[PDB]
């Protein structure tokens, strides 16, 4: 279906430390997106390096890897129609200072390096990120569509 | 006045079923718009066709008419300066996935067919919609202006 | 059955004027109680005296009648298991200053005469109050059983 | 330490289905309790029976084991001073209708069978429940004491 | 009248450092209590000792003085009927773990030493505390009574 | 250096009277901006004219001066990276009706004359406004950077 689209979201160590996990989950739940995977973990260097592989050649890659592996991360997978692009709109933009009020980064962030949450940029990136962070057993298979949310 | 402008708003069956009525009323109350009419009802095919008349030649007309009659609707009328255009901005856009975080559809909707709330598109549409859903007795006549909201 | 119990609730002129209608409705909706009746109206002296009949010989009767008729009131009917005793608990006690934080009066009221909301004191009072404020046509007959709320 | 006390909390299938996971996590985070374990899973009949082992001879045991395995559950472990007793106070009482406004069950529940969340009744039950639902690797070891929350 | 009663409230350094100032102020404003004095300051040892004078011979006195001077404090004065006792009820009890959900300490605190906010225990203590923290010029004199909050 | 930027914000008499002080302070605190100055006062014509000096020859100058002196104002100073531009984004635009939902004016305002809060338009205007409303003693000097908010 088109309503079975999935995105990977990570509440970064700064979002976890600031106690924003519930606030964030509650925003995606109110939207109508279904939580199909959820876990708290301290990421390994390998998970971090494979996750941010598009920034591997840039000077700040080291710091990104160090910071995401510096403390607990809440990894989640949400399912819904256009969940990839929608989840991103809900987060805001790279710079939290330029992110609109009402968005996660707009409401809670001030620094690019401490930008609370990260989401998949595309359906291809999502499917790769989901497989990396989660095992098939850790993901829901039975997802009954809400007739209140979908026509 | 100007500040006596009125708009018609309908919390659709999906918005009532999902328990979003108070959430929605609170947003317009916080804004400074005065509730001049309020009721819960199951709309008739008669009322629905008349309400959705601007789309009577479109292929989706029947579907809009079927859905708005499928369960209880919370019908309301708000009064304030630029309430028609403002109420619409507060709702978001046709596609809830494209609606900005901070708006009703932006925060709670995923599908065009399940887009929670509908509002008048113009002052002319509002005056027609208000007369169609409400009787003069069901509307407030005495509206004292709040000196904290109006200069 | 027992989950089909109904209570009458009135957001008094002070609760309406202060813009607390959406806040209050959202509280009962969150709880799992179903809205089966809703309307805004300016009560007549006849409706006000009939409503406050149990206190018709008390010195404060006139004052209660004068205030409930002084502006718009939001009249509602909620359905659920033990809704009568549960709505009262959610409201708090007669004196809002003695009402616990978390209740409507505890969170928003300071005066007995400006105590925002009133609810039915018993199933008997509820059935009488509902018939007095609402016509059978104004009340839902089809109430969808929620399997997440009720075992 | 005393501040290193841990409790096991489960958002039951009804709490997950109603989209209350984030609302719940936010409440414990706002309090100052640290999340040390988190996961979503559909529990097996075995894990449910071992979890509800204290009631294995009671007539309602079967019903509790059937319901907790009927859909996804969000399993969590929180750390803090008096977290076992405090989480329970935050949840409310067995009957959500008797639970005080401000508590989780007092704000969102109407039925004993659909009472959203369950928490450990003691430190001994917590240590057993934590070991039963989580592997030592799934739980945090490094827990930074907040000098704003602890003297 | 008796609606002119005043209380002194202090958001302690832990309260301020955790970013609970606006949350706390919103609660008293929603209640109907009028803010008649407000300031942020780092208290001097002299002001701290004078404030905590009733406990000057207790073993914990030193610790209370050390902590209230360790960082910024948001000092405020609220006016309204029974504001002294009501403000205390809103705060909760000495131990935040024993404080009811819905109270400031019940919702946000875990430790007696980090109990976010302090309020006057009596009208006599309030009048003394107000004079100690505020100059007559720093306090409002013109307080128009809200007819929506007082009969 | 860059994270030490400061802005001046004034919750205008309309914002104070509508009890919005707590809501506003919370928004800036959630964001990660540090409150370095805070006070409630009734501004003098001298302070008002100096504050609104950039518009001293515009026809609306008198109206702005009259209104900001008509009741209590909550003056505050926030510190953070890009706080001047970010605080304006959080306020919205001049016309609250055109302000996006999620912004303060977008969420609570209807009139240009009653637009709840004013903020510095530039770093130069901020430094001037801060020195005008606050004495150096009234401002924090020791501001430890939060490692959860800054890289
Ligand atoms: C490129 C970004 C931001 N970033 C971190 N440090 C720096 C830095 N020093 N210079 C520039 N950019 C930086 O890193 C990943 P993230 O924060 S998950 O995501 P996003 O939502 O921004 O998005 P996408 O476009 O990666 O999906
Ligand atoms: C024409 C629209 C949208 N729409 C619903 N289904 C479809 C569909 N199948 N194809 C196209 N458009 C669709 O219907 C009305 P509504 O949802 S109250 O919203 P609006 O706020 O956009 O309204 P207005 O702009 O007319 O006020
Ligand atoms: C007798 C009560 C209390 N009361 C109101 N004004 C006064 C007054 N001036 N002197 C004394 N008592 C007063 O009046 C009804 P109400 O306010 S709808 O509701 P309740 O929910 O508290 O209760 P119940 O009456 O339905 O049990
Ligand atoms: C025995 C308890 C209570 N209870 C639930 N259904 C029934 C029922 N049908 N008959 C009797 N008792 C019942 O079951 C677990 P729970 O629902 S998580 O609740 P709790 O958090 O209140 O309790 P505890 O186990 O920590 O005390
Ligand atoms: C003596 C009391 C209690 N107390 C604080 N720390 C300690 C401590 N370490 N050991 C014992 N007792 C302590 O101190 C004041 P506070 O904390 S504002 O609270 P309150 O609500 O009790 O009120 P009041 O005293 O203003 O009435
Ligand atoms: C010039 C503005 C707006 N303004 C008020 N009345 C009028 C009026 N009658 N005609 C035009 N403009 C008016 O005055 C300041 P303020 O209201 S704090 O707004 P802002 O914070 O959006 O401001 P800035 O600092 O960016 O200007």
Short mmCIF file of C-alpha atoms in Angstrom, two decimals, chain B residues 27 29-33 81-83 86 89-90 101-103 147-151, chain F residues 13-14 17-18 96-102 105-111 113-114:
data_model
loop_
_atom_site.label_atom_id
_atom_site.label_comp_id
_atom_site.label_asym_id
_atom_site.label_seq_id
_atom_site.Cartn_x
_atom_site.Cartn_y
_atom_site.Cartn_z
CA UNK B 27 -6.99 26.80 19.68
CA UNK B 29 -10.45 30.42 22.04
CA UNK B 30 -6.67 31.05 22.80
CA UNK B 31 -6.45 33.12 19.58
CA UNK B 32 -9.15 35.52 20.82
CA UNK B 33 -11.98 34.43 18.50
CA UNK B 81 -11.29 40.45 12.91
CA UNK B 82 -10.21 38.45 9.79
CA UNK B 83 -11.59 35.23 11.36
CA UNK B 86 -7.17 33.27 10.02
CA UNK B 89 -4.38 29.43 8.15
CA UNK B 90 -4.92 27.74 11.60
CA UNK B 101 3.47 21.88 12.03
CA UNK B 102 1.49 24.12 14.41
CA UNK B 103 -1.68 23.92 12.25
CA UNK B 147 -10.12 45.37 25.35
CA UNK B 148 -7.14 42.99 25.72
CA UNK B 149 -7.64 41.67 22.18
CA UNK B 150 -8.86 44.80 20.36
CA UNK B 151 -7.39 48.35 20.36
CA UNK F 13 0.15 45.10 29.08
CA UNK F 14 -2.25 43.02 26.94
CA UNK F 17 -3.59 41.10 31.46
CA UNK F 18 -4.48 37.93 29.43
CA UNK F 96 -0.97 38.60 14.48
CA UNK F 97 -3.60 37.54 11.88
CA UNK F 98 -0.79 36.99 9.32
CA UNK F 99 1.49 35.27 11.92
CA UNK F 100 1.93 31.52 11.47
CA UNK F 101 0.28 29.10 13.97
CA UNK F 102 3.15 27.92 16.26
CA UNK F 105 1.13 36.15 17.83
CA UNK F 106 -0.06 33.42 15.43
CA UNK F 107 -1.32 31.37 18.43
CA UNK F 108 -2.81 34.19 20.63
CA UNK F 109 -3.27 37.50 18.75
CA UNK F 110 -5.85 39.18 16.47
CA UNK F 111 -4.81 42.92 16.46
CA UNK F 113 -2.33 47.20 18.60
CA UNK F 114 -2.74 44.20 20.95
#
